[PDB]
């Protein structure tokens, strides 16, 4: 038997997952890989005679894309109930893998938790002045304002990014650079993504950078999620359905959280210290509709409109 997956996640990910997983159940697995987004457009256009039985992708917009298209299965009530809130779909169209948040990442050197504040919106005051980097065109960072503006609203949002410009941000490329820049001293924090600073550690164990939350429930601290999902044209569901369940057994859990630095989606997984323990998460995260965050350009807009993009 085999079974066919879209893939955005990167093959030297997937292979080490798929290739146990294959020895494990007899089951082939024949992978197209892609970028997230591109993968959900290919499938609204594949529709009903695409080939593919299973789609993993790194970014919430694009599954709530698909979605909102009607092409993913319901999946089993034992696939997603017992699952947190944060890493489902309410109505099982699609279950999280891991967790790829967002955490405010800080100088051990010239800044601590202390400095931290309640909201990310409090990043607009003087006290940050020139102090954090921003990286507008990381897609991590667009899918957080994506989730501020679902929240919050646009005039919300598009006044907490021009007030962020005002105060002096330093731009940089991605999420490696900004933690870098941290290290290097140009900047004291950064709004990132969970999963870059685990890497710094495993290379430097005193790499002197933190990250951390903001207060419960706070748009600063979204979880966005590496989710999968069966398409409703797959006619080896069954299938489908064994290789979710191996992605959320607890050695895959275990390998996302220690070596590929995201969180766990599943107790009984031992933490990555950098990123502590699933419970205080889900505390920290804020209660948002991951499927709203299609709706990138929207935000595209309001980052142009803030002078940010």
Known sequence: QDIT?????GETLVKPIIEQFEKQSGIKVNVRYGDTAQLAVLLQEEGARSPADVYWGQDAGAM???????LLATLPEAVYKQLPEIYTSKTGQWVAASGRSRVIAYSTERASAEDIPASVFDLTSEKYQGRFGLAPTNGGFQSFVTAMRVQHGDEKTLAWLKAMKANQPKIYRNNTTQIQAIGDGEIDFALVNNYYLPRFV?????????????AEGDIGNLVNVAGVAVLKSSKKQPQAIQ???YMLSPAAQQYFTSVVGEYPVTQGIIPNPVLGELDTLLQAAPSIDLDQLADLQGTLKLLRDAGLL
């Open 5 to 9: 997956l879209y893939s955005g996640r």
């Open 202 to 214: 495993a290379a430097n164990a005193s790499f002197p950078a933190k990250q951390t939350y903001f």
């Open 64 to 70: 709530g894309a698909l979605a909102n298209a009607g």
């Open 243 to 245: 290789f979710i369940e």
